[PDB]
Design a protein around this ligand. Structure first.
Ligand SMILES: Nc1ncnc2c1ncn2[C@@H]1O[C@H](COP(=O)(O)OP(=O)(O)O)[C@@H](O)[C@H]1O
Ligand SMILES: [Mg+2]
Lengths: 600, 57, 459
């Protein structure tokens, strides 16, 4: 049942006497029992990808062959917890080893077996009942936010022979006993699923509901949807991590799985410190955010091979909660660090590289990762509906969107949130380019917007036309010097500035811009567009008369309106609620109309 | 001139403080030297033969 | 401990570049250190970068010139490069191999630590929430330094990045209105640079709290990629075992990257950009991420990994991959230096990721964040106006544009220009900020809410 180490080249270990080993089986390499996964088979020798540092591993060290593939434990005890790249809890390691460093070769259960969970059965099953994969036969109260559904694993079925009455049970007990054909299966609350296999669904459905983001841009102009996939290929300093944190903090998702794959160590500590201090009311009660989030840490200075396991563990966790009827919006803040791991391993493997040193199958890995997103009808008789969204960062070198990872990613994801380093240098955050970005879900959400708002869509269109027209003018204005501009064009240029400075950018570290409720975004946009139309009309109706209302006349006459419009961001939605904000915006519209009547 | 004399005698204090520390160090280790020799010599005399953990058969 | 005698081999199979390949080795261990003696008595060391069966590939630190095939004698230590560390390393000067060069004795270890180190458990890592007062307005105001932050200075050949680092070493304090142990890795530099820092540390009267590691331009290029780890390993001992606050400065990190690139080429590893290894990022993270505070212990490590940007190319892999790992950068340039501005720090392309937590009520002054953001807006716009005026002429500008040129001109001489020994407080820096911001009318200060302008703007 053992092999022996033949050689070590770093993250790749070669072992012998493993004739019966299959690809993508787990192994334990070394006397510390380091976790690895078999990549290649050459005769009776196996090539092992090891997720822990191989320093100190000797030729001749035993290799334990484990039949089970890389897998994740799924059950109660996930929410609020932080895991490493292979599903080992960091709070349990630190509480058991008393160290500040993560030891190598730690064999710790993913989900604690000491906690006595409060379990209630569905009350609809009886002995002799027929249960199928995905069925829920009880719920565990992890906390007040997420109700943890105990599902029958996929590829399992049979007749019920015993169901645990309501009471206190731990993860080592038996909750459900079922039999199929003589063979009997005893299940606890924890199921095991290979992280490289896609959990099966009844039907993949179109995404027809917004994924609310606490941002003005990245929502009004480039919507994301529940179940959709997007990329943020920002250069260093562009603030893509802050966008990811903002989406996690303030969104309409039920569960967030945050994967720090190659991320700075300070970022995961930042989350653990800040998140417990955030609030999200449930039913009149104030609750912490961490009860509905979970996160995986595989930091930049951790084993590079573990970056692949981290990504697959994250999405597998996301699917698990998707199956329970929750909307999941996971985000892996790197992607490039995963592809980088693939390159380093491919090098050690002496494989023939493709574009820029990356493996030829880079696109294959990204395609199969992102396609696990989507709104689905779940397996299981209870007819759940869920989703997994994926918001993945990319780190193109130099900010040049030409590398194989950015290029392949853009061919897969349906929403492109491109960031511009030259906007970040100006602290124009979020640094969204708004010229190269796009969202392919605009048509999907048009029905939603008409149902709840109506006014939003024509405002979105006019805003894009103004910003695009300003860019078309900026190209020539740089050369002309604003000498040949018509008065109708100067209005576009200055209103476009108004939009850029007050609407597209917001300071996510303030009490007023940390979250931007949609009604506020469309409210203040309506005012900005209403100004555009009234100001453009004012000159269009007077240019041929005996006095033309040039920009300098409206600018001096309505300077107070331009200041009020710029102040619309400083509304503090937590202190001043919807009623005051809408009434305030209505007053600005009246002030504009009255000033225009006195002008024209 | 005042500064040079101060530096001179400041150096004398440095030299005098150093001699104090060196003699104190010698006085301390003289109380443990014999115990350390016994512990170290035992570890040398205790051979402890062993076969490499990875030797097969 | 390791009681078994170590084995000595004369079984060298062959030599290929910097790599000496041995055969007939008993149970080779990966990443173990080998000591070898040349036929002429020269002693050298190297590390096993690959094992396979009875073979092992040793990368020799000093070099492979003079390595024989029949008379070369090698012995395997049986462990990884664990290095002796002690508290009294402060005040000592070492070479890039960890040996003393100050005519003192070898290190009398309190323990032996793995030079590769271990990753700090992110659950016990505590997010930095204290600010360091560098005394430089260009930093303390608009790009604050936190204790536990990683902030390199991006520089270019010929710029005074050595003077800025030296200045920071002496006038780095706290804004709580403190003696930092400095570990300085001088690698890939000439004698005059190393002597400059060594002399400055003595001139500052702080040498008893400074540990130096020197690896000069005329020293082996392979030792240049362990010197940072030697510095950081000592820093980790001091910070996390003895609760001493440590400031670690790594000199031109580009000499690290170039030394690594040479190793990457020698080992035929997969290149990424500009010939650097595809794993350059991972290797840099091993160096950079050895920083920050740890919950339950009163120490910290702050890093300033200054680096030279080849050809002032901010997208060069060295500053690029560093920019992805560290919490921003200070960035100096030639446009300021060529005008005799010191320190020549250009705030526009700079940032501090931990700065947002560091500023404000309970840390410095409540208007800190507002002053910084508006100064960035006004400075960047002034630069945009210069780009315009260079073509259209001064006559094409209006009063809204001239104000930004007035700000830009006054900003660089009042805010950035200081001098090697000008030590300003963070509060004085903000006061200066307001003096410059008050150039504009309230309506143009669009990054600051009226709830702040009404209190501070009138003065
Ligand atoms: N949306 C934002 N709102 C406010 N400040 C931001 C925003 N995005 C970025 N920043 C600022 O700029 C810094 C850079 O963002 P960060 O996410 O660290 O960059 P990266 O793109 O490298 O992940 C942040 O630490 C913060 O100070
Ligand atoms: Mg980031």
């Amino acid at each position: 049942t053992f092999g022996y180490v033949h050689g070590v080249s770093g993250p790749v270990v070669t072992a012998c006497d493993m004739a019966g080993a299959a690809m993508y089986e787990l192994v334990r390499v070394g006397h510390s029992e380091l976790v690895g996964e078999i990549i290649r088979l050459e005769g009776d020798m196996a090539t092992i990808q090891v997720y822990e540092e191989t320093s100190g591993v000797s030729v001749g060290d035993p290799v334990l062959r484990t039949g089970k593939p890389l897998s994740v434990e799924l059950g109660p005890g996930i929410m609020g917890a932080i895991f490493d790249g292979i599903q080992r809890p960091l709070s349990d390691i630190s509480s058991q080893t008393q160290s500040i460093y993560i030891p190598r070769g730690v064999n710790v259960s993913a989900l604690s077996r000491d906690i006595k969970w409060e379990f209630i059965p569905s009350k609809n099953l009886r002995v002799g009942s027929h249960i199928t994969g995905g069925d829920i036969y009880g719920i565990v109260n992890e906390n007040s936010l997420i109700k943890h559904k105990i599902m029958l694993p996929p590829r399992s079925r049979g007749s019920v022979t015993y169901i645990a009455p309501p009471g206190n049970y731990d993860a080592s007990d038996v909750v459900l006993e079922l039999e199929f054909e003589g063979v009997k299966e005893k299940l606890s609350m924890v199921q095991v699923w290979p992280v490289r296999q896609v959990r099966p669904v009844t039907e993949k459905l179109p995404a027809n509901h917004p994924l609310l983001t606490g941002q003005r841009v990245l929502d009004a102009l480039f919507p994301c949807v529940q179940g959709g996939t997007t990329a943020i290929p920002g250069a260093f300093g562009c603030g893509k991590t802050v966008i990811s944190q903002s989406l996690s903090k303030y969104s309409n998702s039920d569960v967030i799985i945050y994967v720090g794959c190659g991320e700075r160590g300070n970022e995961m500590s930042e989350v653990l410190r800040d998140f417990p201090e955030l609030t999200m009311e449930v039913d009149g009660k104030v609750e912490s955010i961490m009860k509905r989030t979970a996160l995986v840490a595989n930091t930049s200075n951790m084993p590079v091979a573990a970056r692949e396991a981290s990504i697959y563990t994250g999405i597998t966790l996301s699917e698990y909660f998707r199956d329970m009827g929750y909307h999941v919006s996971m985000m892996a803040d790197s992607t490039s660090r995963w592809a980088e791991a693939l390159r380093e391993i491919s090098g050690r493997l002496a494989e023939m590289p493709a574009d820029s040193g990356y493996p030829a199958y880079l696109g294959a890995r990204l395609a199969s990762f992102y396609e696990r997103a989507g709104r689905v009808k779940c397996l299981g008789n209870p007819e759940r509906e869920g989703s997994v969204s994926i918001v993945g960062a990319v780190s193109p070198p130099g900010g040049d969107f030409s590398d194989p990872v950015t290029s392949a990613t853009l061919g897969i994801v349906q929403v492109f949130w491109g960031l511009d380093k030259k906007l970040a240098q100006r602290k124009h955050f979020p640094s969204v380019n708004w010229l190269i970005s796009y969202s392919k879900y605009m048509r999907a959400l048009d029905e939603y917007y008409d149902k709840h708002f109506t006014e939003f869509v024509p405002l979105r269109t006019k805003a894009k036309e103004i910003l695009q027209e300003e860019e078309d003018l900026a190209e020539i204005v740089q050369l002309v010097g604003k000498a040949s501009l018509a008065e109708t064009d100067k209005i576009t240029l200055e209103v476009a500035k108004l939009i850029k400075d007050d609407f597209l950018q917001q300071n996510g570290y303030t009490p007023y811009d940390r979250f931007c409720p949609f009604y506020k975004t469309v409210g203040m946009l309506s005012n900005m567009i209403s100004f555009y139309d009234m100001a453009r009309r004012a000159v269009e109706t007077t240019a041929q008369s005996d006095n033309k209302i040039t920009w300098s006349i409206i600018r001096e006459h309505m300077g107070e309106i331009l200041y009020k419009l710029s102040s619309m961001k400083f509304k503090d939605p937590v202190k001043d609620g919807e009623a005051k904000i809408k009434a305030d915006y209505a007053q600005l519209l009246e002030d504009m109309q009255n000033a225009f009547r006195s002008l024209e | 001139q005042a500064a040079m004399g101060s530096q001179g005698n400041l150096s004398a204090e440095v030299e005098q403080a150093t001699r104090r520390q060196v003699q104190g160090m010698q006085s301390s280790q003289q109380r443990n030297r014999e115990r350390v020799l016994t512990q170290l010599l035992g570890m040398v005399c205790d051979v402890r033969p062993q076969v490499h953990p990875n030797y097969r058969i | 401990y390791l009681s078994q005698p170590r084995l000595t081999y004369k079984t060298v199979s062959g030599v290929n570049g910097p790599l000496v390949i041995l055969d007939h080795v008993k149970f080779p261990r990966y990443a173990e250190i080998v000591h070898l003696t040349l036929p002429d008595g020269t002693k050298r060391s190297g590390q096993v970068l690959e094992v396979s069966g009875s073979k092992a590939v040793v990368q020799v630190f000093e070099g492979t010139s003079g390595i024989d095939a029949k008379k070369t004698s090698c012995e395997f230590t049986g462990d990884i490069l664990r290095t002796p560390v002690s508290e009294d390393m402060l005040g000592r000067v070492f070479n890039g191999s960890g040996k003393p060069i100050d005519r003192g004795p070898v290190v009398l270890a309190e323990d032996f630590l793995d030079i590769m180190g271990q990753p700090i458990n992110p659950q016990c890592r505590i997010y930095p929430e204290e600010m360091i007062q560098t005394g430089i307005s260009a930093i303390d105001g608009m790009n604050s330094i936190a204790r536990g932050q990683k902030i390199p200075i991006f520089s270019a050949a010929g710029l005074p990045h050595n003077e800025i680092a030296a200045q920071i070493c002496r006038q780095a304090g706290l804004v709580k209105k403190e003696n930092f142990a400095i570990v300085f890795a001088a690698m890939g530099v000439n004698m005059e640079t190393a002597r400059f820092f060594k002399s400055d540390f003595e001139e500052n009267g702080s040498m008893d709290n400074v540990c130096l590691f020197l690896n000069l331009a005329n020293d082996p290029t392979i030792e240049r990629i362990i010197t940072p780890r030697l510095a950081l390993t000592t820093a980790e001992f001091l910070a996390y075992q003895c609760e001493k606050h440590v400031l670690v400065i790594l000199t031109d990190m580009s000499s690290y990257a170039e030394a690594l690139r040479e190793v990457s080429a020698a080992r035929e590893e997969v290149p990424g950009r500009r010939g650097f290894p595809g794993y350059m990022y991972t290797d840099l993270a091993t160096i950079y991420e050895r920083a920050g505070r740890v919950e339950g212990r009163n120490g910290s490590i702050t890093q300033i990994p200054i680096l030279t940007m080849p050809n002032d190319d901010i997208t060069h892999p060295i500053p690029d991959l560093t920019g992805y790992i560290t919490e921003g950068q200070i960035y100096v340039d030639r446009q300021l230096h060529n005008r005799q501005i010191y320190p020549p720090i250009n705030v526009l392309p700079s940032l501090s990721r931990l700065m947002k937590s560091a500023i404000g009520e309970g840390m410095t002054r409540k208007d800190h964040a507002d002053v910084s953001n508006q100064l960035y807006a006004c400075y960047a716009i002034g630069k945009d106006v210069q780009a315009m005026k260079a073509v259209v002429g001064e006559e094409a500008l209006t009063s809204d544009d001239l104000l930004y040129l007035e700000f830009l001109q006054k900003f660089e001489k009042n805010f950035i220009t200081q001098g090697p020994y000008e030590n300003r407080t963070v509060y004085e820096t903000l006061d200066i900020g307001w003096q410059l911001l008050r150039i504009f009318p309230k309506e143009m200060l669009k990054r600051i809410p009226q709830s702040t302008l009404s209190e501070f703007y009138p003065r």
